[PDB]
Design a protein around this ligand. Structure first.
Ligand SMILES: [Mn+2]
Ligand SMILES: [Mn+2]
Ligand SMILES: [Mn+2]
Ligand SMILES: [Mn+2]
Lengths: 745, 745
DNA sequence: TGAGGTAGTAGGTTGTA
DNA sequence: TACAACCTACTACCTCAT
DNA sequence: TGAGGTAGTAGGTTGTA
DNA sequence: TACAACCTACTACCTCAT
């Protein structure tokens, strides 16, 4: 079989207990809180003493060599107290920061091509390398003609065991940067209006965009009364303007939007934000050619981290601590337990489907009762393309025909739709205003013979004349009319169809049309464990100060959506108030009581993120009702990657592969072939419950594969996944009584 | 006729341009922003120099006498720059702060009873007086046996004119305080668990409540490793524990909830929060006897401020500046323009109603089409009382009978209700859990013959076994069933009815029942101005970090509710995003187009609070559609009171009385007789429009008097008023298509 | 917005106290 | 103030092939 | 939560920059 | 950090009287 591993390198040899110099910090300012200044005190000590190692215990600053007591700082009076040898088993974190400091110090003295510094060391977790190991295993600078510099971005995190053995955890991202700021582009004369930029001089986190390029020079006094050069000279940064030339004073002032008022900045201060979109606007060949360099399968990540670990080498000051340059052959050496979860079985109209593609041959599982009449909006300039699009949709759905002819892939009468073009309507809408899109949706409500909408929207791209998806879905949510939107590009795929490329777009459109009219295309036959309903809690945050309301979804043990609950009030962050948990879980027990006749014996709560709520509330609320419950924290954003080993040959793992240690599990849900990247596994952890962790993993992986809006499964379980989809389609929630019509899908 | 005035005293004589000593502040810290430290620099200079006058211009600190340059502060290096005589017409605010400083300095040397300081001077706007002018015009300390001290709280705000004349604006609140902290109550042995307290030692704004009283002493070392006395000695406040006795070390530690973790505080630090509820729990005779002292009509406020101004007297250092002790006979001397708005006319089934009481004799204006069958929830222990309650409601509504007999007050068949107790239902619910209240509401949905609910809830008071209003209105909003709730006390008023006291409760219940089924009891015949629809915008904030979504209401020019729009996403504070204004005002124009066939020629926007949104967005959006628009900022919370003068005899003004200067108007909407307080007028101001301000005042006062859920009018116009009511009933918004059924009413 | 996944980039919130 | 560990928003590329 | 108004108390947000 | 000018939340008293 295939083993599973993590991006982990063993440390050859051990570190030893060695002498530190423990210091202390007191709050010299008007405050007295040393925890409010502890990290800033460490950083000012570190930078003010030629980058020498300083470490942080709760108030204690440890330091590897005897360094003088710094009273110079205005906020921290660092003073020597005692010198001691810290033991290993009490001080895992301090030895971890020791090892990562010495790895940073060892990597600072490694160069490529004899003159060029290979790494960019800040003595931290993250390590920017200036060169990249390419696909052909050669260290090479990835720069563009326009100077877009690609940089590999490493992330060490060594973990020291109590016996002194160290285990180097790694990852590698990519960094988009450039040596060319705005000033060389203005000397080149490039159009930089409306351009997203950042300042390397201020650490303010705020999205900066250029308004214009004022021909006013920087030596000329601005509307602030003085010039900008003297503005930075007065503000304790005259060293930045000291290295200027007389050519540099001819720089035109570029103004910038700063989300409250326009800031007046010199163009030397500002670097453009380097995204994928910016490369697509500037250097498309570079943006296409690094796509095999940033989306990295596990073999290429292993080769990148192998070159990294070989560039670390032996550290001569930790009892000759060196690292192995290969992964663990099995993660049972880490406490993790490998394994592959059994794939779900899915039921159709005929029985077991082998793919999600076969649901269109075998037939849908649960058609909604009745008959659903279409009604199509389309932009007026795309009438024949839209006609061919709806023709292909209706011939797929009702007549079972693809390219007009009856096909073996598609069974006849998949959904009970009636779209007679002699009877039914093609209301066309002019592209233009948003209020005209809303009135177009009202005019398609104005006739009573429309029960579902296949409205054609303009593209998500093409940032001119306004997109109609958002006004359409707003008005159809206000009127409780379900609707599957299609962009003009997919309508062009349907009208210009010659191969089977449009067929897959028709598969996912028909699954959307089915799920939005309350149909269910497949269900699982059984689900592992003693569960009666799933609850998927998630609290999202769109912007700063805006939190998505705590959208819950309620499933049965067979995965089909019982209910969703959206509280009308927003809340204070990722903590759900206990009145909101009262609303949510009363709605859970009410809906399971209605659809099943009794309370659930077991509830499994899939909280997306951290379940920071009162477990005392849960124990009270479900011990009052004799309900066993479980809380699982399913977490997406994790830099850990699970690689799969076939005798040293690193590869992506199959879906349903997990690693398991205690109450934390990392599980792969997506099958990604190489040259498409690497699967980002889910961080799954139990905050309370009686279930073993493998049962919650089987439930979560079965809840990924029963996503009913695509023919390929979701990365998330659809508890947290559909909670995220409701959080995205939160202004699209339909008005009428909450039911099994998955509007968001 | 009756004039109108404000709480304003003229300053006899003039102030003169006199020599200051202008200073400057630079940002000595790691920052450099002097605006971030300007007020703190003024306060540290003021307190560090025996409370000498310091003033604030943009960065300039002015100071009345030559004071030494203070380099002592760690954040501000105050240094003398120049000494000058500031002219009057440039420096209104600085002379205002001069005059209020010298008023504070003059009042600090005025005492009552020869030994007791009358005022508590912080040299600010607010001035706590220790004694109160009572109703019998005598200065007397209002203290309780339990030491609850009532204190009058003044608020000076003098405004200096360019010629040097000063006009003293005043107000007076009351202060609830006590000299008795927790320690004297614990020496008295009082139960202080669960009690809301504040600390006089820390300025942290956070609602503190006591968890328990730990018998652990303060000298004993706590779980923080040390004792609390040494905790305040280590934290630069050893002077507070220096004046203690050996008896004081026997104080038991009282812990306190601090909204993130329990703080460990000495009982000497903590003072109980003194509310009306706390007086009601402790000293009810004191809480009833000061009710004529805190709710103050305009005559008693005038006598209080008269005694205040006589206690100021002549200030010998401002060219003998003294104040008149009487109000302005007319506010045309202030630029304000007095006037009384014509009362609205209201239409019924027969025509002009003279009161809102006569709508039950003349008949409702617009009954909803169809027939509405009741259905009653009631608590199981109140069955006969509930039976008599619903009997009185139905005999008022359908049969037109009060106390079982046909009355001349009530016309027969007010609403088309059918409540046959042989046919219809009395579902009774056990008092208890919240989920049982929700299942009771579901079981009353479970039968189809219920079209409105008259559910009987337990009281808003009586903080034991749970109130059922919130689960009932949640489930009835989820099921789109309108419902008028009644507390057990009002059911007892109906069952124990002998006088006509229950009749008025029946008036407002039947108006609620009508407005919730989409009926309209009265409309105005015409409304002054060229208006076609009203838009009431309001963004409320319940807690810290939670903002109510920007609830809009759309009316016609005849006041009846066209529409309400609640955006599903919360936002960032009192700024409405332009996408939210797009949603809101497209919904406005859509709903007026649907109900009227065309766009409105004129829109009047009643924004509640500040209209801080882009007026460029409004001009773009309504110049694209050729819609004239107006924005009026209707503001509640205002310390200005409008008094009415009848030849020196100050009194409350009638409703519809306004004062008007430019684009700011204060208008009285509530008729309050004396001994019930004073009317709090509305601050009404136009941020943009073409209408004159008097037309917007007539529209706003007509929009107060057409409140259709009470027989006495609202203080707010029902644009901003119903926006506030939707913001309160925001988790009660019904599911189905938004219409004229005022669920919130 | 066919759907889903990877990838960057930018910015958040919360515990750590 | 500050990082870690989670998030969200957005945009590219890329595939889909019983 | 009959409805509405005054009154406190507590705490917010935003401009002032 | 800080006030001004607006807000919200909560609780008392108080009236309602064609
Ligand atoms: Mn989310
Ligand atoms: Mn979709
Ligand atoms: Mn509000
Ligand atoms: Mn009500």
């Amino acid at each position: 079989v295939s083993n599973l591993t993590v991006e982990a390198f063993e440390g050859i040899g051990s570190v030893n207990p060695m002498l530190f110099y423990q210091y202390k910090v007191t709050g010299k300012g008007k405050y007295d809180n040393v925890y409010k200044i502890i990290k800033s005190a460490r950083y000012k000590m570190h930078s003010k003493n030629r980058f020498k190692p300083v470490f942080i215990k709760d108030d204690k600053l440890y330091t590897l060599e005897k360094l003088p007591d710094i009273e110079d700082l205005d906020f921290a009076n660092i003073n020597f107290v005692k010198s001691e040898v810290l033991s290993i088993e009490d001080n895992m974190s301090i030895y971890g920061e020791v090892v990562e400091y010495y790895i940073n110090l060892k990597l600072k003295k490694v160069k490529v091509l004899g003159k060029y510094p290979k790494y960019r060391i800040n003595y931290s977790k993250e390590i920017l390398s200036n060169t990249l190991l390419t696909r052909e295993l050669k260290d090479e600078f990835k720069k563009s003609n326009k100077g877009f510099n690609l940089k590999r971005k490493f992330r060490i995190s060594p973990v020291v065991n109590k016996m002194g053995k160290v285990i180097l955890y790694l990852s590698c991202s990519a960094d988009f940067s450039t040596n060319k700021n705005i000033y060389e582009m203005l000397k080149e004369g490039l159009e930089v209006e409306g351009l997203a930029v950042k300042s390397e001089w201020s650490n303010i986190s705020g999205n900066l965009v250029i308004e214009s390029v004022l021909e006013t020079k920087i030596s000329e006094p601005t509307s602030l009364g003085q010039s900008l050069i003297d503005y930075y000279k007065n503000n304790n940064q005259g060293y930045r303007v000291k290295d200027f030339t007389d050519e540099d004073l001819n720089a035109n002032i570029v103004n910038v939007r700063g989300n409250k008022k326009i800031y007046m900045y010199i163009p030397h201060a500002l670097k453009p934000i380097i995204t994928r979109e910016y490369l697509a606007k500037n250097d498309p060949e570079f943006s296409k050619e690094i796509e095999q360099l940033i989306k990295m399968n596990m073999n290429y990540r292993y080769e990148t981290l192998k070159s990294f670990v070989n560039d670390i080498g032996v550290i001569e000051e930790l009892n000759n601590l060196s690292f192995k340059n290969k992964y663990y052959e099995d993660v049972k050496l880490l406490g993790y337990s490998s394994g592959k979860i059994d794939e779900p079985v899915l039921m159709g109209a005929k029985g077991i489907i082998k793919n999600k593609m076969q649901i269109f041959s075998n037939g849908f599982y649960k058609l909604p009762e009745g008959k659903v009449r279409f009604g199509v909006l389309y932009p007026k300039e795309f009438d024949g393309v839209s006609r061919k699009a709806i023709r292909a949709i209706y011939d797929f759905s009702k007549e079972g025909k693809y390219h007009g002819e009856s096909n073996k892939y598609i069974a006849e009468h998949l959904i009970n739709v009636e779209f007679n073009p002699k009877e039914c309507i093609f209301e066309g809408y002019e592209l233009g205003d948003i209020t005209e899109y809303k009135k177009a949706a009202l005019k398609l409500n104005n006739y009573n013979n429309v029960d579902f909408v296949i409205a054609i929207v303009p593209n998500m791209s093409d940032e001119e004349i306004e997109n109609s998806y958002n006004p359409f879905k707003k008005i159809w949510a206000e009127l409780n009319l379900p609707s599957q939107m299609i962009s003009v590009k997919t309508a062009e795929i349907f009208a210009n169809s010659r191969d089977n490329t449009a067929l897959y777009y028709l598969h996912n459109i028909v699954l959307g049309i089915l799920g939005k009219i309350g149909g269910i295309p497949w269900v699982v036959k059984d689900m592992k464990g003693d569960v009666d309903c799933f609850v998927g809690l998630d609290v999202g945050t769109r912007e700063k100060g805006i939190h998505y309301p705590a959208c819950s979804v309620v499933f049965d043990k067979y995965g089909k959506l019982i209910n969703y609950y959206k509280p009308n009030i927003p809340q204070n962050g990722e903590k759900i108030n206990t009145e909101i948990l009262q609303e949510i879980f009363d709605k859970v027990l009410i809906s399971y009581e209605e659809e099943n006749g009794a309370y659930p014996k077991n509830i499994v709560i899939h909280r997306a993120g951290f379940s920071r709520e009162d477990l005392d509330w849960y124990e009270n609320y479900f011990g009052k009702k004799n309900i066993k419950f479980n809380i699982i924290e399913v977490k997406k954003s994790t830099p850990l990657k699970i690689a799969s080993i076939n005798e040293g040959n690193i590869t992506n793992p199959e879906k349903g592969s997990y690693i398991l240690r205690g109450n934390k599990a990392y599980m792969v849900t997506t099958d990604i072939k190489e040259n498409l990247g690497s699967p980002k596994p889910l961080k799954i952890e139990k905050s309370y419950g009686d279930i073993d962790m493998l049962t919650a993993l089987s439930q979560i992986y079965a809840l990924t594969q029963i996503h009913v809006g695509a023919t390929k499964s979701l990365r998330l379980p659809i508890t947290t996944g559909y909670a995220d989809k409701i959080c995205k389609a939160i202004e699209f929630i339909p008005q009428g009584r909450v039911d099994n019509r998955l509007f968001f899908l």
